[PDB]
Amino acid sequence: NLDIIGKRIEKIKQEHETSWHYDQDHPYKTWAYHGSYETKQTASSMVNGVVRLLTKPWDIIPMVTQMAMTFKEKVDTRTQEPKEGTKKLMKITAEWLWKELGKKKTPRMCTREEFTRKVRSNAALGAIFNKWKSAREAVEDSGFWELVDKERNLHLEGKCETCVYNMMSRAIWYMWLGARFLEFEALGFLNEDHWFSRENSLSGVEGEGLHKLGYILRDVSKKEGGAMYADDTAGWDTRITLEDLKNEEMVTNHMEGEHKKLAEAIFKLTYQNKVVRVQRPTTVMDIISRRDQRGSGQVVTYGLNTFTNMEAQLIRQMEGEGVFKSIQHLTVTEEIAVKNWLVRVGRERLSRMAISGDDCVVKPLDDRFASALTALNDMGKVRKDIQQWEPSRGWNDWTQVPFCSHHFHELIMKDGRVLVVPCRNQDELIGRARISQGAGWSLRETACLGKSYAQMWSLMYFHRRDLRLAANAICSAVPSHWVPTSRTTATHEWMTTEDMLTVWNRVWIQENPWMEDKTPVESWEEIPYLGKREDQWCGSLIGLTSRATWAKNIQTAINQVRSLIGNEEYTDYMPSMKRFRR
């Protein structure tokens, strides 16, 4: 407790010594509370006018229009300590899984130089604005790096002063850029060197991309076994136990020298003990602490979520196969049995899964998995929207399984080749493209964001009639040479000024390991759509009079947006579609 967090606490107490007060009507039950001090401030969602002017039929669809308007009582819940048998299962599995992940990878520190380049081309690193404005500035100033040095030497000394979380089913904990560096230096290798790639982790999909995920689910479907299970956890980050945080820390057993010590410090001082500043309107700042739950960078969060999810799902598979009888306690011969299962079939069982952070799909050996709930519930990974002891419902068709907020269609091209394409409710796709994050956006910047959505749609959602038409309209309305942008960035092949037909051919044909015939496609008309009824099922407006008038009059909408942006060089992409080709 207070010997590891006191220094951070003491330090904050003193920057607001004219403010401090141990408030009496404080709302925290499960968070240790330490004091308050004076502040007063809050970024809401703005509409992208370029995308909305080119999607007029959607102006009357509540599922689209409501997306642009607008539980912190789940962060304040407590998970019980797992039974001794559960803790044994987790430690054996975690030890074995880090060794597997480490067979073909070398832990290493990430560098200032690597970190600088990241900030100098925008990644959502989650820092705070003070002493310098943006992240960009602080990185070129040498003072910063002395701040970083003091903290670093403090961490080598087993102490911490400035690694404090700032709170804001979402809950995003920003730290100052310095603390993010020290996190990145110690643990960035997990992401930077692709430890959760499919090739390296067998269950993972890190760096895949939506054009790969459906082919991966279809490969899992090919395995002999039972239904496909895709159970979501209720508030995954809130159910991470101190025992989970300790099994994650075992990655330091593969490390050496300084690195081993820097990594141990991040795990001990920032993850297994945390200090957080929260805004309360009754507006003060509350300095609360706790030992458990997830609070890391979004990117280390992804890797450790994937790891701990892989662990939980191998254990649930062990329970379904009757590798152990009870979670109360493992016998000695049950430990040998668990160790032996892992060595004999562990890699085969990883390959039966697709795991992306807290999201999973499992194709178990058979349907006993559905009612194998004791380890899963005791680890605290309680399933969303189903009674705790009710058996899971599995999917009989891989095209119906939900994964990474998508389902996947099998689409046959006129030449017989097979596309496995990503899909979701079209209202969700249109509603997101109509939103910009942040203000101060110029017309040009708003246009370049609309173009990024348009190019993503041409590459991923070309099979949806409304999206191929709206993508062509947006790319016709935005100056041909203007570069697509995004303010927070898997593989993003649509972020380019290259011709989208050439990019389509590279992604879907040339680089696609599931396509044997590499004959290029010569026009967009070779590239198929979903069945018209399937397109409607997935939210198409095809068949409505509003949509017919939009399609027929699209050159008028394009010309409206061209007039607003002004006299620039434009391309007409609409004749890439049969119906505008004269």
Distance CA 254, CA 362 (A): 28
155 labeled binding residue? yes
**DSSP string of 55-106, one letter each residue:** -GGGGG-HHHHGGG---TTTTT--PPPPPHHHHHHHHHHHHHHHHHHHTT--
C-alpha 276 chain-centroid distance: 22
- Judged by CB under 5 A, the chain residues 192 through 221 that form the site for Zn ion are none
259 labeled binding residue? no
Are 353 and 220 contacting, i.e. CB atoms less than 8 angstroms apart? yes
Token pair for 377? 């519930």
Quick one: 303 or 539, whose CB is closer to Zn ion?
539
Residues with Cβ within 8 Å of residue 416, at least 6 apart in sequence: none
- Judged by CB under 5 A, the chain residues 516 through 545 that form the site for Zn ion are 538
112 CB neighbour count, 10 Å cutoff:
13
Q: Give rounded-to-5 percent helix, strand, coil for the chain.
A: 45, 10, 45
- Considering the complex, what minimum distance in angstroms separates the CB of residue 270 from Zn ion? 6
Distance CA 311, CA 315 (A): 6
Quick one: 151 or 185, whose CB is closer to Zn ion?
151
Quick one: 98 or 457, whose CB is closer to Zn ion?
457
Residues with Cβ within 8 Å of residue 513, at least 6 apart in sequence: 215
User: For strand 418-423 and strand 32-33, is the pairing parallel, antiparallel, or unpaired?
Assistant: unpaired
Quick one: 94 or 423, whose CB is closer to Zn ion?
423
Quick one: 61 or 163, whose CB is closer to Zn ion?
163
Q: Which residues pair with 279 in a beta bridge?
A: 285
Quick one: 110 or 373, whose CB is closer to Zn ion?
110
Quick one: 151 or 248, whose CB is closer to Zn ion?
151
- Considering the complex, what minimum distance in angstroms separates the CB of residue 119 from Zn ion? 20
| # chain residues binding Zn ion, by CB under 5 A | 5
- Which range in 157-165, 246-254, 255-263, 374-382 contacts Zn ion by CB under 5 A? 157-165
Q: Does 423 bind Zn ion (CB under 5 A)?
A: yes
- Which range in 12-20, 42-50, 419-427, 553-561 contacts Zn ion by CB under 5 A? 419-427
- Considering the complex, what minimum distance in angstroms separates the CB of residue 87 from Zn ion? 28
- Considering the complex, what minimum distance in angstroms separates the CB of residue 409 from Zn ion? 6
Distance CA 501, CA 506 (A): 9
Q: Does 411 bind Zn ion (CB under 5 A)?
A: no
Token pair for 54? 């080119």
Q: Out of 160, 362, 454, 478, point to the residue binding Zn ion (CB under 5 A).
A: 160
- Considering the complex, what minimum distance in angstroms separates the CB of residue 467 from Zn ion? 11
- Considering the complex, what minimum distance in angstroms separates the CB of residue 259 from Zn ion? 16
Distance CA 548, CA 535 (A): 15
- Which range in 41-49, 60-68, 159-167, 307-315 contacts Zn ion by CB under 5 A? 159-167
Q: Does 163 bind Zn ion (CB under 5 A)?
A: yes
- Considering the complex, what minimum distance in angstroms separates the CB of residue 513 from Zn ion? 23
Site string for Zn ion, 273-302 (x = CB under 5 A): ------------------------------
- Judged by CB under 5 A, the chain residues 135 through 154 that form the site for Zn ion are 151
> Angle, nearest 10°, between helix axes 554-565 and 443-460?
140
Token pair for 312? 């939980």
Binding-site residue numbers for Zn(2+) are 151, 155, 160, 163, 407, 409, 423, 538
Q: Which residues would be at the binding site for Zn ion (CB under 5 A)? A: 151, 160, 163, 423, 538
